[PDB]
Coordinates of C-alpha atoms (C1' of nucleotides) and ligand atoms in Angstrom, one line a residue:
Chain A
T244 CA 35.8 17.7 -2.5
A245 CA 32.0 17.4 -2.5
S246 CA 32.2 16.3 1.1
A247 CA 28.5 15.4 1.5
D248 CA 29.3 11.8 2.6
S249 CA 27.9 11.5 6.1
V250 CA 29.5 8.0 6.2
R251 CA 33.1 9.3 5.7
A252 CA 32.3 12.3 7.8
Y253 CA 31.2 10.1 10.7
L254 CA 34.3 7.9 10.3
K255 CA 36.6 10.9 10.4
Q256 CA 34.6 12.1 13.5
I257 CA 34.9 8.8 15.4
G258 CA 38.6 8.6 14.6
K259 CA 39.4 11.3 17.1
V260 CA 39.2 9.5 20.4
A261 CA 41.8 6.8 21.3
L262 CA 41.1 3.1 21.9
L263 CA 41.4 1.7 25.4
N264 CA 42.6 -1.3 27.3
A265 CA 41.5 -3.6 30.1
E266 CA 42.6 -1.7 33.2
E267 CA 41.2 1.5 31.8
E268 CA 38.0 -0.3 31.1
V269 CA 37.9 -1.5 34.7
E270 CA 38.5 2.1 35.9
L271 CA 35.7 3.4 33.7
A272 CA 33.3 0.7 34.9
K273 CA 34.0 1.4 38.5
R274 CA 33.5 5.2 37.9
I275 CA 30.1 4.7 36.2
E276 CA 28.8 2.3 38.8
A277 CA 29.9 4.6 41.6
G278 CA 28.3 7.6 39.8
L279 CA 25.0 5.7 39.4
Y280 CA 24.9 4.7 43.1
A281 CA 25.8 8.3 44.0
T282 CA 22.8 9.7 42.0
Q283 CA 20.6 7.1 43.6
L284 CA 21.7 7.9 47.1
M285 CA 21.3 11.6 46.5
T286 CA 17.8 11.1 45.2
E287 CA 17.0 9.0 48.3
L288 CA 18.5 11.7 50.6
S289 CA 16.7 14.5 48.7
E290 CA 13.3 12.8 49.5
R291 CA 12.8 12.8 53.3
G292 CA 16.5 12.1 53.7
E293 CA 19.3 14.3 55.0
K294 CA 20.6 17.8 54.2
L295 CA 23.6 16.7 52.1
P296 CA 26.7 18.3 53.5
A297 CA 28.0 20.9 51.0
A298 CA 31.3 19.2 50.4
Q299 CA 29.7 15.7 50.3
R300 CA 27.0 16.9 47.9
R301 CA 29.7 18.5 45.8
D302 CA 32.0 15.5 45.4
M303 CA 29.2 13.0 44.9
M304 CA 27.7 15.2 42.2
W305 CA 31.2 15.2 40.7
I306 CA 31.0 11.4 41.0
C307 CA 27.7 11.4 39.1
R308 CA 28.9 13.7 36.3
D309 CA 32.1 11.7 36.0
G310 CA 30.3 8.4 35.7
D311 CA 28.3 9.9 32.8
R312 CA 31.6 11.1 31.4
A313 CA 33.1 7.6 31.6
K314 CA 30.1 6.0 30.0
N315 CA 30.3 8.4 27.0
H316 CA 34.1 7.9 26.8
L317 CA 33.6 4.1 26.5
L318 CA 30.9 4.5 23.9
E319 CA 33.3 6.7 21.8
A320 CA 36.0 4.0 22.4
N321 CA 33.9 1.1 20.9
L322 CA 32.2 3.0 18.0
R323 CA 35.0 1.5 15.8
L324 CA 34.0 -2.0 17.0
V325 CA 30.5 -1.2 16.0
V326 CA 31.4 -0.3 12.5
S327 CA 33.8 -3.2 12.1
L328 CA 31.0 -5.6 13.1
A329 CA 28.3 -3.9 11.0
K330 CA 30.3 -4.3 7.8
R331 CA 29.5 -8.0 7.5
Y332 CA 25.7 -7.6 7.5
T333 CA 25.4 -4.7 5.0
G334 CA 24.3 -5.9 1.6
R335 CA 20.9 -7.1 2.8
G336 CA 19.7 -4.3 5.1
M337 CA 19.0 -0.6 5.3
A338 CA 21.4 2.4 5.3
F339 CA 24.6 1.4 7.0
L340 CA 24.2 4.3 9.5
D341 CA 21.0 2.8 10.9
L342 CA 22.9 -0.4 11.8
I343 CA 25.7 1.6 13.3
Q344 CA 23.2 3.4 15.6
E345 CA 21.5 0.1 16.6
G346 CA 25.0 -1.1 17.5
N347 CA 25.5 2.0 19.7
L348 CA 22.2 1.3 21.4
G349 CA 23.5 -2.2 22.1
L350 CA 26.7 -0.7 23.5
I351 CA 24.8 1.5 25.9
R352 CA 22.9 -1.6 27.1
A353 CA 26.1 -3.5 27.5
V354 CA 27.9 -0.8 29.4
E355 CA 24.8 -0.5 31.6
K356 CA 25.0 -4.3 32.3
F357 CA 28.7 -5.0 32.4
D358 CA 30.5 -6.6 35.3
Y359 CA 34.3 -6.2 35.8
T360 CA 34.8 -8.6 38.8
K361 CA 34.7 -11.6 36.3
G362 CA 38.0 -10.2 34.9
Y363 CA 37.3 -10.2 31.1
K364 CA 38.0 -7.8 28.3
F365 CA 34.9 -5.8 27.5
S366 CA 35.1 -6.5 23.7
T367 CA 33.3 -9.9 23.8
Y368 CA 30.3 -8.8 25.8
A369 CA 30.0 -5.6 23.7
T370 CA 30.1 -7.7 20.5
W371 CA 27.3 -10.0 21.6
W372 CA 25.1 -7.1 22.8
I373 CA 25.7 -5.2 19.6
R374 CA 24.9 -8.1 17.3
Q375 CA 21.7 -8.9 19.2
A376 CA 20.5 -5.3 18.9
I377 CA 21.4 -5.0 15.2
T378 CA 19.7 -8.2 14.2
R379 CA 16.6 -7.2 16.2
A380 CA 16.3 -3.8 14.6
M381 CA 17.0 -5.2 11.2
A382 CA 14.2 -7.7 11.6
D383 CA 11.7 -5.1 12.9
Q384 CA 12.5 -2.6 10.2
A385 CA 13.3 -5.0 7.3
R386 CA 10.3 -4.9 5.0
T387 CA 7.3 -2.6 4.6
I388 CA 5.4 -5.5 6.2
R389 CA 6.5 -6.6 9.7
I390 CA 7.6 -10.2 10.2
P391 CA 8.3 -11.1 13.9
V392 CA 11.6 -12.6 15.0
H393 CA 10.9 -16.3 15.3
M394 CA 9.3 -16.5 11.9
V395 CA 12.2 -14.5 10.5
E396 CA 14.5 -17.1 12.0
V397 CA 12.7 -20.0 10.4
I398 CA 12.6 -18.1 7.1
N399 CA 16.4 -17.6 7.3
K400 CA 16.9 -21.3 8.2
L401 CA 14.7 -22.4 5.2
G402 CA 16.7 -20.1 3.0
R403 CA 20.1 -21.3 4.2
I404 CA 19.0 -25.0 3.8
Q405 CA 17.6 -24.3 0.3
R406 CA 20.8 -22.5 -0.7
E407 CA 23.2 -25.1 0.6
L408 CA 21.1 -27.8 -1.1
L409 CA 21.2 -25.9 -4.3
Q410 CA 25.0 -25.7 -3.9
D411 CA 25.4 -29.4 -3.2
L412 CA 22.7 -31.1 -5.3
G413 CA 22.5 -28.4 -7.9
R414 CA 18.7 -28.3 -8.3
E415 CA 16.1 -26.3 -6.4
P416 CA 14.6 -28.8 -3.9
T417 CA 10.9 -29.5 -3.5
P418 CA 8.4 -28.4 -0.7
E419 CA 8.3 -32.0 0.6
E420 CA 12.1 -32.0 0.5
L421 CA 12.3 -28.9 2.7
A422 CA 9.5 -30.2 4.9
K423 CA 11.5 -33.4 5.6
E424 CA 14.8 -31.5 6.0
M425 CA 13.4 -29.0 8.5
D426 CA 11.2 -31.6 10.3
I427 CA 8.0 -29.5 9.4
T428 CA 5.0 -30.0 7.2
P429 CA 4.8 -29.2 3.5
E430 CA 1.9 -26.9 4.1
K431 CA 4.0 -25.0 6.7
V432 CA 6.8 -24.8 4.1
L433 CA 4.3 -23.3 1.7
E434 CA 3.1 -20.8 4.3
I435 CA 6.7 -19.8 4.9
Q436 CA 7.2 -19.3 1.2
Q437 CA 4.0 -17.2 1.1
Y438 CA 5.0 -14.9 4.0
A439 CA 8.5 -14.7 2.6
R440 CA 7.0 -12.8 -0.4
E441 CA 8.3 -9.2 -0.7
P442 CA 6.1 -6.4 -2.1
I443 CA 6.8 -5.4 -5.7
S444 CA 7.3 -1.7 -6.4
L445 CA 4.4 0.2 -8.1
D446 CA 7.2 2.2 -9.7
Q447 CA 9.1 0.4 -12.5
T448 CA 10.1 0.7 -16.1
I449 CA 8.2 -1.0 -19.0
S455 CA 6.3 3.1 -17.7
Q456 CA 5.0 2.2 -14.3
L457 CA 2.8 -0.8 -13.4
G458 CA 0.5 1.7 -11.8
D459 CA -0.8 2.5 -15.3
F460 CA -2.4 -1.0 -15.8
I461 CA -3.9 -1.6 -12.4
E462 CA -7.6 -2.2 -12.9
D463 CA -9.8 -1.3 -10.0
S464 CA -11.7 -4.5 -9.6
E465 CA -13.1 -3.2 -6.3
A466 CA -14.7 0.0 -7.5
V467 CA -17.9 1.7 -8.9
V468 CA -19.6 -0.8 -11.2
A469 CA -21.3 2.2 -12.7
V470 CA -24.4 0.1 -13.6
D471 CA -25.3 -1.8 -10.5
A472 CA -25.7 1.5 -8.7
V473 CA -28.6 2.7 -10.8
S474 CA -29.7 -1.0 -11.0
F475 CA -30.0 -1.1 -7.2
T476 CA -31.7 2.3 -7.2
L477 CA -34.4 1.0 -9.5
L478 CA -34.5 -2.2 -7.6
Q479 CA -35.4 -0.4 -4.4
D480 CA -38.0 1.7 -6.2
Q481 CA -39.6 -1.5 -7.5
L482 CA -39.6 -3.1 -4.0
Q483 CA -41.3 -0.1 -2.5
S484 CA -43.9 -0.3 -5.3
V485 CA -44.5 -4.0 -4.8
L486 CA -44.8 -3.6 -1.0
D487 CA -47.3 -0.8 -1.6
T488 CA -49.2 -3.3 -3.8
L489 CA -49.8 -5.5 -0.8
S490 CA -51.5 -4.7 2.5
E491 CA -49.9 -1.9 4.6
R492 CA -49.6 -4.1 7.7
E493 CA -48.0 -6.9 5.6
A494 CA -45.6 -4.3 4.0
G495 CA -44.6 -2.8 7.4
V496 CA -44.1 -6.3 8.8
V497 CA -41.8 -7.3 5.9
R498 CA -40.0 -4.0 6.1
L499 CA -39.2 -4.5 9.8
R500 CA -38.4 -8.2 9.3
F501 CA -35.8 -7.5 6.6
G502 CA -34.7 -4.0 7.8
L503 CA -35.9 -2.0 4.8
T504 CA -36.8 1.2 6.8
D505 CA -33.6 1.8 8.8
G506 CA -31.2 -1.0 8.1
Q507 CA -31.8 -2.6 11.5
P508 CA -33.3 -6.1 11.0
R509 CA -36.2 -6.3 13.5
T510 CA -37.0 -9.8 14.7
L511 CA -40.3 -11.5 15.6
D512 CA -40.4 -10.5 19.3
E513 CA -39.7 -6.9 18.5
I514 CA -42.2 -6.7 15.7
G515 CA -44.8 -8.5 17.8
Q516 CA -44.2 -6.0 20.6
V517 CA -44.5 -2.9 18.3
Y518 CA -47.7 -4.4 16.8
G519 CA -49.0 -5.6 20.2
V520 CA -49.4 -9.2 19.1
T521 CA -47.6 -12.5 19.5
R522 CA -44.6 -13.8 17.5
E523 CA -46.5 -16.8 16.2
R524 CA -49.1 -14.4 14.9
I525 CA -46.4 -12.5 13.0
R526 CA -44.8 -15.7 11.8
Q527 CA -48.2 -16.6 10.3
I528 CA -48.3 -13.1 8.7
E529 CA -44.8 -13.5 7.4
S530 CA -45.4 -17.0 5.9
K531 CA -48.6 -15.9 4.2
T532 CA -47.0 -12.7 2.9
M533 CA -44.0 -14.5 1.5
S534 CA -46.3 -17.1 -0.1
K535 CA -48.2 -14.2 -1.7
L536 CA -44.9 -12.8 -3.0
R537 CA -43.9 -16.1 -4.5
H538 CA -46.9 -15.9 -6.7
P539 CA -45.5 -15.0 -10.1
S540 CA -47.7 -11.9 -10.8
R541 CA -46.0 -10.2 -7.8
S542 CA -42.6 -11.6 -8.9
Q543 CA -42.5 -11.2 -12.7
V544 CA -41.2 -7.6 -12.2
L545 CA -38.5 -8.9 -9.7
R546 CA -37.3 -12.1 -11.4
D547 CA -35.0 -10.3 -13.8
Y548 CA -33.1 -8.6 -10.9
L549 CA -30.9 -11.6 -10.3
Chain B
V495 CA -34.1 1.0 -31.6
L496 CA -30.5 1.9 -32.2
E497 CA -31.4 3.9 -35.3
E498 CA -33.9 5.9 -33.4
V499 CA -31.4 6.8 -30.6
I500 CA -28.7 7.6 -33.2
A501 CA -30.9 10.0 -35.3
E502 CA -29.8 13.7 -34.7
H503 CA -27.0 13.2 -32.2
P504 CA -23.6 14.3 -33.5
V505 CA -20.2 12.7 -32.7
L506 CA -16.6 14.0 -32.8
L507 CA -13.9 12.5 -35.0
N508 CA -10.4 13.1 -33.7
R509 CA -7.3 12.1 -35.7
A510 CA -3.9 12.2 -34.0
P511 CA -1.6 14.0 -34.5
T512 CA -4.1 16.9 -34.3
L513 CA -1.9 19.5 -36.0
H514 CA -4.5 22.3 -36.1
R515 CA -8.1 23.3 -35.3
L516 CA -9.8 21.1 -37.8
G517 CA -8.3 17.9 -36.4
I518 CA -11.6 17.5 -34.5
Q519 CA -14.9 17.9 -36.4
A520 CA -18.5 17.1 -35.5
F521 CA -20.5 14.8 -37.8
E522 CA -24.0 13.3 -37.8
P523 CA -23.4 9.5 -37.5
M524 CA -25.2 7.0 -39.6
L525 CA -25.1 3.3 -39.3
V526 CA -22.9 1.4 -41.8
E527 CA -22.4 -2.3 -42.5
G528 CA -18.9 -3.5 -41.6
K529 CA -16.4 -2.5 -39.0
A530 CA -14.6 0.5 -40.6
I531 CA -15.6 4.2 -40.0
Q532 CA -16.8 5.7 -43.3
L533 CA -15.3 9.2 -43.6
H534 CA -16.5 11.8 -46.1
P535 CA -13.7 12.2 -48.7
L536 CA -13.7 16.0 -48.6
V537 CA -12.4 16.4 -45.0
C538 CA -9.3 14.4 -45.9
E539 CA -7.5 17.7 -46.5
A540 CA -8.4 19.0 -43.0
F541 CA -7.5 15.7 -41.3
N542 CA -4.3 15.1 -43.4
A543 CA -5.6 11.6 -43.8
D544 CA -4.8 9.2 -46.6
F545 CA -6.5 5.8 -46.4
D546 CA -3.3 3.8 -46.2
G547 CA -4.6 2.4 -42.8
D548 CA -4.9 5.4 -40.6
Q549 CA -7.2 5.3 -37.6
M550 CA -9.6 7.8 -36.0
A551 CA -11.2 8.2 -32.6
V552 CA -14.9 8.7 -32.2
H553 CA -15.9 10.7 -29.1
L554 CA -19.4 11.4 -27.9
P555 CA -20.8 14.7 -26.4
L556 CA -23.4 14.1 -23.7
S557 CA -24.8 17.3 -22.1
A558 CA -27.1 19.5 -24.0
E559 CA -24.4 22.2 -24.0
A560 CA -21.9 19.8 -25.6
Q561 CA -24.4 18.7 -28.2
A562 CA -25.1 22.3 -29.1
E563 CA -21.4 23.1 -29.3
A564 CA -20.8 20.2 -31.6
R565 CA -23.9 21.0 -33.7
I566 CA -23.2 24.7 -34.2
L567 CA -19.4 25.3 -33.9
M568 CA -17.7 22.0 -34.8
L569 CA -20.0 20.8 -37.6
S570 CA -18.3 19.9 -40.9
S571 CA -20.4 22.1 -43.1
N572 CA -19.7 25.1 -40.8
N573 CA -15.9 24.7 -41.1
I574 CA -15.0 25.0 -44.8
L575 CA -12.2 27.6 -45.0
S576 CA -8.8 27.5 -43.4
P577 CA -8.3 29.3 -40.1
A578 CA -5.0 30.4 -41.5
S579 CA -5.6 31.9 -45.0
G580 CA -9.4 31.4 -45.5
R581 CA -8.9 29.2 -48.5
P582 CA -11.4 26.4 -48.8
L583 CA -10.3 23.0 -47.4
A584 CA -13.5 21.4 -48.5
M585 CA -12.3 22.3 -52.0
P586 CA -12.4 19.4 -54.4
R587 CA -8.9 17.9 -54.8
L588 CA -7.1 15.0 -56.5
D589 CA -9.5 12.7 -58.3
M590 CA -12.5 15.0 -58.3
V591 CA -10.3 17.8 -59.7
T592 CA -9.2 15.4 -62.5
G593 CA -12.9 14.6 -63.2
Chain C
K1031 CA -3.2 -9.4 -47.2
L1032 CA -1.5 -7.4 -44.4
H1033 CA -1.8 -8.1 -40.7
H1034 CA -3.7 -4.9 -39.8
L1035 CA -7.2 -6.3 -39.8
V1036 CA -10.2 -4.3 -38.7
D1037 CA -11.3 -6.9 -36.1
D1038 CA -8.0 -6.3 -34.3
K1039 CA -8.4 -2.5 -34.3
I1040 CA -12.1 -1.6 -33.9
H1041 CA -12.6 -0.6 -30.2
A1042 CA -15.2 1.2 -28.1
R1043 CA -15.9 1.9 -24.5
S1044 CA -19.0 3.3 -22.7
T1045 CA -17.9 2.4 -19.1
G1046 CA -15.2 -0.1 -18.2
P1047 CA -12.2 -0.5 -15.9
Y1048 CA -10.4 2.4 -14.1
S1049 CA -6.9 3.2 -13.1
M1050 CA -5.7 2.8 -9.5
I1051 CA -3.7 5.8 -8.2
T1052 CA -5.4 8.2 -10.7
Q1053 CA -9.1 7.5 -11.4
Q1054 CA -8.8 7.9 -15.1
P1055 CA -10.2 5.2 -17.5
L1056 CA -7.8 2.5 -18.3
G1057 CA -5.9 2.2 -21.6
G1058 CA -5.4 -0.5 -24.3
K1059 CA -7.7 -2.7 -26.3
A1060 CA -6.5 -5.6 -24.1
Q1061 CA -8.7 -3.7 -21.6
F1062 CA -11.5 -1.5 -22.6
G1063 CA -10.0 1.9 -21.8
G1064 CA -10.7 5.1 -23.8
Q1065 CA -8.8 7.3 -26.2
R1066 CA -6.3 9.7 -24.8
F1067 CA -7.8 13.1 -25.6
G1068 CA -4.4 14.7 -25.6
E1069 CA -3.0 18.2 -25.2
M1070 CA -3.2 19.1 -28.9
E1071 CA -6.8 17.9 -29.0
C1072 CA -7.4 20.2 -26.0
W1073 CA -5.9 23.0 -28.0
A1074 CA -8.2 22.3 -31.0
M1075 CA -11.2 22.5 -28.6
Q1076 CA -10.0 25.7 -27.0
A1077 CA -9.5 27.3 -30.5
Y1078 CA -13.0 26.3 -31.3
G1079 CA -14.1 27.8 -28.0
Chain D
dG1 C1' -58.9 -15.7 7.0
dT2 C1' -57.0 -14.5 11.7
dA3 C1' -55.3 -15.3 15.8
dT4 C1' -53.5 -19.0 19.3
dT5 C1' -50.7 -23.3 22.4
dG6 C1' -47.4 -27.1 22.7
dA7 C1' -43.5 -29.7 21.1
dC8 C1' -39.4 -29.9 18.1
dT9 C1' -35.5 -28.6 15.9
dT10 C1' -32.0 -24.5 15.0
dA11 C1' -29.0 -20.5 14.6
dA12 C1' -26.8 -17.1 17.6
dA13 C1' -24.5 -16.1 21.2
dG14 C1' -21.9 -16.9 26.1
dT15 C1' -18.5 -19.1 28.3
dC16 C1' -14.4 -22.2 29.8
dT17 C1' -10.8 -24.0 28.9
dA18 C1' -7.1 -23.7 26.4
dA19 C1' -3.5 -23.7 23.1
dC20 C1' -1.1 -21.4 20.4
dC21 C1' 0.8 -17.1 18.5
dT22 C1' 3.6 -12.9 19.7
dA23 C1' 6.2 -9.4 21.9
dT24 C1' 10.4 -8.9 24.9
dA25 C1' 14.7 -9.8 27.1
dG26 C1' 19.3 -12.1 27.1
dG27 C1' 23.1 -14.6 25.5
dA28 C1' 29.9 -12.7 29.6
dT29 C1' 36.9 -15.2 26.0
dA30 C1' 38.8 -12.1 22.2
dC31 C1' 36.5 -10.0 18.6
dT32 C1' 37.9 -1.8 17.2
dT33 C1' 37.6 3.5 10.7
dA34 C1' 31.8 1.8 3.9
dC35 C1' 32.0 1.9 -0.2
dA36 C1' 33.6 3.1 -5.0
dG37 C1' 34.7 -3.0 -7.6
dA38 C1' 23.1 13.3 -25.3
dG39 C1' 22.8 18.5 -26.3
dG40 C1' 21.6 23.2 -25.7
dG41 C1' 20.7 27.2 -23.2
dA42 C1' 21.4 29.4 -19.5
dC43 C1' 23.3 31.2 -15.3
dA44 C1' 26.5 31.5 -11.7
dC45 C1' 31.0 30.7 -9.8
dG46 C1' 35.3 32.2 -10.9
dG47 C1' 40.6 33.3 -15.1
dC48 C1' 43.1 37.5 -17.2
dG49 C1' 44.1 42.6 -17.8
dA50 C1' 43.9 48.2 -17.2
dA51 C1' 43.3 51.7 -13.3
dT52 C1' 43.9 53.8 -8.9
Chain E
rA1 C1' 10.3 -4.9 -24.7
rG2 C1' 8.4 -5.0 -29.7
rC3 C1' 5.2 -2.7 -33.5
rG4 C1' 1.4 0.7 -36.9
rA5 C1' 0.1 5.5 -38.7
Chain F
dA1 C1' 46.0 44.9 -3.3
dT2 C1' 41.2 46.2 -4.3
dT3 C1' 37.9 47.9 -8.4
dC4 C1' 35.7 47.1 -12.5
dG5 C1' 35.6 45.1 -16.9
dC6 C1' 36.2 41.6 -19.8
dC7 C1' 36.7 36.3 -20.5
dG8 C1' 36.2 31.3 -19.2
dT9 C1' 34.3 26.9 -17.4
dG10 C1' 31.2 24.1 -14.7
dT11 C1' 26.6 22.4 -13.3
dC12 C1' 21.9 21.9 -14.2
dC13 C1' 16.1 21.6 -16.8
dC14 C1' 14.0 20.7 -20.9
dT15 C1' 12.7 18.6 -26.6
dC16 C1' 4.7 15.7 -31.6
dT17 C1' 0.4 12.8 -31.2
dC18 C1' -2.4 8.5 -31.3
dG19 C1' -3.1 3.4 -31.1
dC20 C1' -1.9 -2.3 -30.5
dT21 C1' 0.5 -6.8 -28.2
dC22 C1' 21.2 -18.5 15.8
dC23 C1' 19.3 -19.8 19.8
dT24 C1' 16.7 -20.0 24.8
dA25 C1' 13.3 -18.6 28.2
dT26 C1' 8.8 -15.6 30.1
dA27 C1' 4.7 -13.6 30.0
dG28 C1' 0.8 -11.9 27.9
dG29 C1' -2.7 -11.5 23.9
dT30 C1' -5.5 -13.8 20.6
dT31 C1' -8.6 -17.0 18.6
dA32 C1' -10.2 -21.2 18.2
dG33 C1' -12.6 -24.7 19.5
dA34 C1' -15.8 -27.1 21.6
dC35 C1' -19.7 -27.4 25.3
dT36 C1' -23.8 -25.0 26.9
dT37 C1' -27.6 -21.8 26.9
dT38 C1' -31.2 -19.1 24.9
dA39 C1' -34.1 -16.5 21.7
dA40 C1' -35.9 -18.1 17.5
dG41 C1' -38.1 -20.2 13.7
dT42 C1' -41.0 -24.0 12.5
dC43 C1' -45.0 -27.6 12.5
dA44 C1' -49.4 -29.6 14.0
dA45 C1' -53.8 -28.9 15.8
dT46 C1' -57.8 -25.6 16.8
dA47 C1' -61.4 -22.2 17.9
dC48 C1' -63.7 -18.2 16.2
Ligands
LIG1 MG1 -1.4 7.1 -44.2

DNA sequence: GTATTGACTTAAAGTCTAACCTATAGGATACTTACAGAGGGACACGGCGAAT
RNA sequence: AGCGA
DNA sequence: ATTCGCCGTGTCCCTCTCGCTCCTATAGGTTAGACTTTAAGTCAATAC
């Protein structure tokens, strides 16, 4: 047998309960609405309300539990509608079961927000609610990257237009062609193509691509020691100059803590004015541009 | 300057498939004109290497311990006999035997 | 003259590109890569000690 | 050389408005069961027969 | 996927 | 019919190395974009 198919097991499961008709649906809807109002009234009467008479409390609690019963009965009734609807979409989505469950969520929404006084079979409203929920969940859970609904819709419209034009014309149209067809810009079309891209799988057969994936962002393995020696040389050169000049440069360019101190802060910490320090900075940088202080640093670019 | 760095610094010569222990041996490198590794003819037996176009891999020990290991244990002149039967594999063969 | 010319074979690496998921050196002369010091070579080294 | 004041331009924020993405809800005729479309050694789950 | 030892 | 001893069949992990070349409607968040302010950097002259 090898009965490990949850699909067939679930179908066999949902085949147990019988399908219903319009008057039965009206009865169930009335029962659920009455049960909900009963629970609401009992909560209201439990808080600063009234000591519910034993018999009244009893039969209204019965009404509540029976409303829940009817809700569940209806959901069991229309599971088959869910599967029948879900069949069309499968082929471009996830596990069938996921779509079925989204359909069930749409059903509980529909049975929550159904009205019987309009005198209609429940099937249509159920259908629309189901489809809305399925499409929403499919979109939210389609790709490893998330693409919100309106952009999903324009992507689908672009795809349908391109496919029908391929069927009719026979050639793949152009970005300007799709821009004029969809009343949008060619750059927008290009962006929709770009965001339409789906990730490739690191796992493949060729071997796996993961083998040949150079780590362009990684240890350079030479610039590390290069920067170490660089810093050593800068400390040396700064020691060659005056200590005040060296400290001023270190604070100006953040060589001591990584925090770049500016003219007002350095003038404050040296007890002088920012123009004084600007003169200091200009003279020191002019001193540094003199090649004897720069022959040992020129090669570091 | 390359000569000076090279002097007294052994390298390892792997040949796949490394059937047995002498597939890897440590040699003192010396610089040679051209682009082909010049291998001493008398380790051909150990490497099972005829010169019909076979290729070898040069590794490079770095730490002092690795250099000592290559120098003392895996040097060519220190691995003459077989590990199997103790017969010499540096034994002259083929053309030298004919001579 | 056969098409197995030295210029198309000689290869070396001191430090070059690296793999992604595993941090091993890459492979192939198209890249730099290094030589796979494989399991039998490991055995040779252990036998030497 | 070292430390100042008074324009004169400049980058870095701060803010106001805004404008443009983005997440969420709903859509009320009827609409009721997925799909399918090597070989070898070894062990464990199970045929065939004598005994009580 | 193709190829050399 | 259960026990114990045989056979028999079905389902599963493992086998050289190295290289090369569908739509609508709301409400809220985000950023963006430009106008305005301010600390900031510069230049010219100067006195000691
Ligand atoms: Mg050969």
